[PDB]
């Protein structure tokens, strides 16, 4: 019956079937309960959408159309929860936040 | 050659959904693929440990919800739990 996919059944963009296959073959459990890839794909899609929206906002404030890893770093480090999630994570070609300590300024 | 899979078309679909004027570079796509794989590994490992602690041999959406409550910080975890519950409800209500 035309073989509609599970992501369109769940109304997602991230693949339910590929996430199910990676959960099955990734040596996590004996069984996968078939609603777990839907939840996983939804959580991954939400986190991707939040990061991409903040990065696109940073690129728009930087007057750039395209997102570079600097925009991803500026999106992640300016958010407390995103920086808590990726505290031990290095983003390549992302740089650092502009931050000079207040004592080092003149006068 | 050998067909290596990624999340590039999926992240691009999400990007064109939330920003239908804004492109992305190859390096930023590599960052996004690494992010999705890392968070997948974290949530799946926490759900695997949660299933192993309670003498369960399956991973259900309850294990994934509890893992999302564990790794993710507060409002991030709350909105991710809302998104996952909405998706599982839509998947169950529609075959």
């Amino acid at each position, epitope marked *: 019956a035309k073989a509609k996919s599970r992501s369109s059944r769940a109304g997602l963009q991230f693949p339910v079937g590929r996430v199910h296959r990676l959960l099955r073959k990734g040596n996590y459990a004996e069984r996968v309960g078939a609603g777990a890839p839907v939840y996983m794909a939804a959580v991954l899609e939400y986190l991707t959408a*939040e990061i991409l929206e903040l990065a696109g906002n940073a690129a728009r404030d930087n007057k750039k159309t395209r997102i570079i890893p600097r925009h991803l770093q500026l999106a992640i480090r300016n*958010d*407390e*929860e995103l920086n808590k999630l990726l505290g031990k994570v290095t983003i390549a070609q992302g740089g650092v*936040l502009p931050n000079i300590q207040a004592v080092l300024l003149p006068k | 050659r050998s067909r290596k899979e990624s999340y590039s078309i999926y992240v691009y679909k999400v990007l064109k959904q939330v920003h239908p004027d804004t492109g992305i570079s190859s390096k930023a796509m590599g960052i996004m693929n690494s992010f999705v794989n890392d968070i997948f590994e974290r949530i799946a490992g926490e759900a695997s440990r949660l299933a192993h602690y309670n003498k369960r041999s399956t991973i259900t959406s309850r294990e994934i919800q509890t893992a999302v409550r564990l790794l993710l910080p*507060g*409002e991030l975890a709350k*909105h991710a739990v809302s998104e996952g519950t909405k998706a599982v409800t839509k998947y169950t209500s529609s075959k």
Partner: single-chain antibody, 226 residues
Framework: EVQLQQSGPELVEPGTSVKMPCKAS????????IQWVKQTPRQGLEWIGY????????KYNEKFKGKATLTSDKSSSTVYMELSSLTSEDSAVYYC?????????????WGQGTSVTVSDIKMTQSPSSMHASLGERVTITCKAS??????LSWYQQKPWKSPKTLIY???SLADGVPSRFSGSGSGQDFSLTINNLESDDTATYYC?????????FGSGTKLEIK
């Protein structure tokens, strides 16, 4: 748990400056922005700006740029608001509200508001004022001038009280709000539905967009029962 303590009313002479405290408790203070909303009976609610205590990040409305100054003090968990060069049109109630840095999140918990007396995208709400019975259905429209990605919230305000968050993300219910209220719509067309009425529902209902950089409230509907 979560509360935003605000000071009493101010009787200020014009041309001076006034400080406003927003002492906060019950949550991790640095992880949530504090927004400031001004409320006059002639222009309704107007979003002024916000402070992020994580990086002390400011953002102001264009009509309040320079006139308003936001500061944060993380030691006492306090947010300060400065108004300088007080024009006679400053007699208004000022609320400070908590809002997470997540885009889906809204102004969930509000302060009591300080009454100060001097001595973009436009939300169109179709019913200005309507009458409903004890068990009728209420439908309120919030037609938007531009497009927003479902970033609309519905608030209920009693007379002489702080607004109460009903609906966030245009469909999701707030914490503690009963399931009688139901939000619907997306894009430019939104609606709030009250299922069955009580005597509590005599209030003014507003819709706020936060999909773009200037946040805009709606005109508001006055709903009174019997």
């Amino acid at each position: 748990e979560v509360q935003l303590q605000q000071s009493g009313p101010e009787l200020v002479e014009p041309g001076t400056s006034v400080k406003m405290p927003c002492k906060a408790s019950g949550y991790t203070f640095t992880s949530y922005t504090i927004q400031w909303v001004k409320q006059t009976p002639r222009q309704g609610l107007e979003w002024i700006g916000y402070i992020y205590p994580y990086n002390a990040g400011t953002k102001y409305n264009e009509k309040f740029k320079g006139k308003a100054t936001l500061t944060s003090d993380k030691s006492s968990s306090t947010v300060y608001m400065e108004l300088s060069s007080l024009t006679s049109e400053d007699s208004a109630v000022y609320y400070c509200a908590r809002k997470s840095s997540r885009l889906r999140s809204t102004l969930d918990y509000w302060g009591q508001g300080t009454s100060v007396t001097v001595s973009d995208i436009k939300m169109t709400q179709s019913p200005s004022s309507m009458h409903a019975s004890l068990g009728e259905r209420v439908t309120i429209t919030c037609k938007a001038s531009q497009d927003i990605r479902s970033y609309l919230s519905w608030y209920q305000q009693k007379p002489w009280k702080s607004p109460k968050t009903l609906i966030y993300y245009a469909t999701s219910l707030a914490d503690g709000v009963p399931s009688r209220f139901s939000g619907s719509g997306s894009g430019q067309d939104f609606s709030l539905t009250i299922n069955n009425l009580e005597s509590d529902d005599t209030a003014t209902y507003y819709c706020l967009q936060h999909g773009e950089s200037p946040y805009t409230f709606g005109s508001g509907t006055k709903l009174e029962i019997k």
